[PDB]
Design a protein around this ligand. Structure first.
Ligand SMILES: NS(=O)(=O)c1cccc(-c2ccc(C3CCNCC3)cc2)c1-c1nnn[nH]1
Ligand SMILES: [Zn+2]
Ligand SMILES: [Zn+2]
Length: 230
């Protein structure tokens, strides 16, 4: 029942319940003349919500906030962007105007600024070394090392054993590595192995794009990246 790309018009946002107090958000966006689905995460934080990643654009992110208001009815107070690309930060200005406190690592902020992308307000220290982990509300943020991008973070929800991989993790049906322009194809398998080692109890793995599954998404991603490399 997870929504697919052809099921979501660009500008609409769907929520999908992953576990008690954990949802993914799914949106679609046009990029270089093709339409892609994209996931983020929502985690209940008492009587508040923590958002992971924008819905890829200003209008999509306004629609995301409206969908959250309708379906969940708890305020989004903080958001974390997991890397500097537009599917993660595009819409930060909408979040900020709506009073959401926006966060990203200094690595992500510098890359977003150099790229001309929207820049989260606050800096997340303690994530600059591969294998670093910090607590942020109801999640753990983990920097696995360079993969899809040099700054990519993953997010674990310990109460639910949910791992959100962002664009460092591909769905099982993936046959291509996506946009690798900012990737480190050689380090990516090592970064995936670090995630595997750190989160062996993950029950659900959510990719940046496409269907959630189990821990197999991690090895599959390393395999996709190796096929791209040669
Ligand atoms: N995050 S990004 O800016 O590099 C991006 C922008 C536009 C399209 C994409 C994009 C996303 C997925 C795909 C493929 C991956 C394999 N399955 C079909 C879609 C292609 C491009 C991406 C991306 N995210 N992760 N990897 N690339
Ligand atoms: Zn990206
Ligand atoms: Zn992406």
């Amino acid at each position: 029942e997870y929504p697919t790309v052809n099921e979501i018009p660009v500008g609409e946002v769907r929520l999908y319940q992953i576990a008690d107090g954990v949802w993914s958000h799914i949106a679609t966006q046009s990029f270089d003349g093709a339409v892609y689905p994209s996931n983020g995460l929502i985690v209940r934080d008492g009587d508040e919500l923590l958002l992971i990643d924008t819905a890829w654009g200003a209008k999509n992110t306004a629609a995301l906030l409206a969908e959250i208001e309708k379906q969940i009815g708890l305020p989004v107070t903080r958001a974390v962007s997991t890397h500097f690309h537009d599917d993660r930060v595009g819409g930060v200005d909408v979040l900020r105007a709506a009073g959401v406190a926006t966060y990203a690592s200094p690595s992500t902020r510098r890359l977003a600024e150099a790229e001309g992308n929207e820049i989260p307000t606050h800096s997340l220290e303690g994530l600059s070394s591969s294998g670093d982990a910090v607590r942020f509300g109801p999640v753990e943020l983990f920097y696995p090392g360079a993969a899809h991008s040099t700054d990519n973070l993953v997010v674990y929800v310990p109460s639910a054993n949910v791992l959100y991989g962002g664009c460092a993790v591909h769905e099982l049906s993936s046959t291509s590595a996506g946009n690798v322009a900012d990737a480190d194809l050689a380090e990516w398998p090592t970064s995936v192995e670090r995630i595997q080692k750190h989160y062996p109890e993950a029950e659900v793995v959510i990719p940046g794009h496409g269907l959630p599954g189990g821990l197999d998404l991690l090895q599959h991603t390393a395999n996709v990246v190796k096929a791209h490399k040669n």
